[PDB]
Amino acid sequence: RRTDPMVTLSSILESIINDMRDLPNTYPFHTPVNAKVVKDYYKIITRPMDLQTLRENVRKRLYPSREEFREHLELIVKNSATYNGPKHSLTQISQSMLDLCDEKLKEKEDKLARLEKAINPLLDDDDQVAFSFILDNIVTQKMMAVPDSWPFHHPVNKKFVPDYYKVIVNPMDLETIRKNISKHKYQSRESFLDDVNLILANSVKYNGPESQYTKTAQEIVNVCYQTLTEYDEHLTQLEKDICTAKEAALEEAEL
């Protein structure tokens, strides 16, 4: 049953690296230029690339799609253009590798498009963006409007509260939550609420259960819950559409 789409994609990329390595005359691009032999090379080339580095990157799961892989590959040709010359023999050799890569990626175009959706199912998904937008409005319109909430709007300032980060191991604030929303970190309200509740847990632990600041944090948490309830039906639909889209993508990658 379930194979990880990033493993499947990386294996195709790795196979392409090996086909490029096999090509005649490509050896100077297999490994990084040796600084001790080409003494000025890294003064000219500031983003170096070679087949070994590319393969380590594939291994490290750095590429979620064709596009980021190809970009790095192309840097091998651009760097040769710059260093050896746009029309130099070595530059035509590097281009021979880019050309083989494109041919192999065209060959596997349908499987790759499916792996790529499975790896990043919610890129430009209107349901995720709509869901994020509603959460961001709960934060800015409701949670940040709680009287005296400002000290929870941004991370605690160490300058005025110097033991904070010694006491609190997992700090959280509304600005950090908004940054998470902006990056579409939350797919359902459960993970958003983990962060919102962490704000109150930190204040119960640092300021104490009866502190005025804990009472404020408690009101921020209450308004968050009340507004989510208000919007429950609309949010359930979005959550359903998001969780379903992820699953459908992972299955079409298998099938």
Author numbering: 1398 to 1652
Q: What do the authors report?
A:
Bromodomains (BRDs) are protein interaction modules that specifically recognize ε-N-lysine acetylation motifs, a key event in the reading process of epigenetic marks. The 61 BRDs in the human genome cluster into eight families based on structure/sequence similarity. Despite large sequence variations, all BRD modules share a conserved fold that comprises a left-handed bundle of four α helices (αZ, αA, αB, αC), linked by loop regions of variable length (ZA and BC loops), which line the Kac binding site and determine binding specificity. The four helices form a deep cavity that is extended by the two loop regions (ZA and BC loops), creating a largely hydrophobic Kac binding pocket.
Multiple protein interaction modules can be tightly linked to form a single stable interaction domain, or they can be connected by flexible linker sequences allowing conformational adaptation to diverse sequences motifs. In contrast, the two BRDs in TAF1 are free to orient independently as shown by the different domain orientations in the dual-domain structure determined here and a previously published model (Jacobson et al., 2000). The frequent combination of multiple interaction modules in the same protein suggests that the epigenetic reading process involves concomitant recognition of several PTMs. Insertions x6 are present in the C-terminal BRDs of TAF1 and TAF1L and possibly PRKCBP1.
